[PDB]
């Protein structure tokens, strides 16, 4: 494989882990103050205890936001529509 795949999939993954590291750090910090188990660290395992944050708005806020986004983007009602160009369709059917 040439181009971007010249290094190999694992080689590319390891090189770009450094680029994504600040986003992981921020995600861990955001999880620390909302829901610690939502974004565990790479060193977290089955023995890790997640302390409840001293404030509750973060956990309450994340759950409310994720639920409210879910109803807005994927409701029971159909949220996508297939539309045919009205002029183009009329130029094809009589």
């Amino acid at each position: 494989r040439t181009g971007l795949a010249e290094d190999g999939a694992k080689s590319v993954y390891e090189r770009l882990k450094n680029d994504r590291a600040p986003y992981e750090t921020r995600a861990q910090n955001c999880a620390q103050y909302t829901i610690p188990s939502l974004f565990p660290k790479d060193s977290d395992n089955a023995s890790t205890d997640y302390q409840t944050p001293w404030q509750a708005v973060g956990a309450r806020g994340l759950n409310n936001l994720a639920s409210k986004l879910m109803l807005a983007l994927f409701p029971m009602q159909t949220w996508m529509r297939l539309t045919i160009s009205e002029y183009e369709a009329k130029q094809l059917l009589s």
């Binding site: 494989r1 795949a5 190999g8 999939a9 694992k10 993954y13 770009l16 995600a27 974004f39």
Partner: protein, 97 residues
């Protein structure tokens, strides 16, 4: 994943810790790599031959790092896809999107 008939085919979620994306300033996705830690017994057959054929005896519970590489091809402006395990591309994993 590609649907197989009427079989239950839930989509796979990758958290940020399990994938990397390279994206230019223009915003185009150049390449994506996903890492799957799958046990040898749970491996797909095609991937399993790659691990078996390379050499060594793997326990059924032993974890295998499967890397799927999706990158922008220079020609035709399409995405070339393949799965890589233990430094070797899996036979039949090559594809395009």
């Amino acid at each position: 994943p590609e649907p197989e008939g009427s079989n239950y085919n839930p989509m796979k979620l990758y958290r940020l810790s399990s994938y990397v994306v390279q994206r230019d300033a223009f915003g185009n996705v150049l390449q994506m790599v996903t890492r799957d830690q799958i046990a040898f017994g749970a491996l797909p057959e095609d991937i399993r031959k790659a691990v078996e054929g390379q050499g060594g005896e793997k326990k059924a519970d032993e974890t295998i790092d499967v890397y799927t590489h999706i990158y922008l091809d220079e020609d035709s402006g399409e995405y070339l896809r393949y799965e890589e395990v233990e430094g070797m591309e899996v036979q039949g994993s090559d594809g395009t999107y």
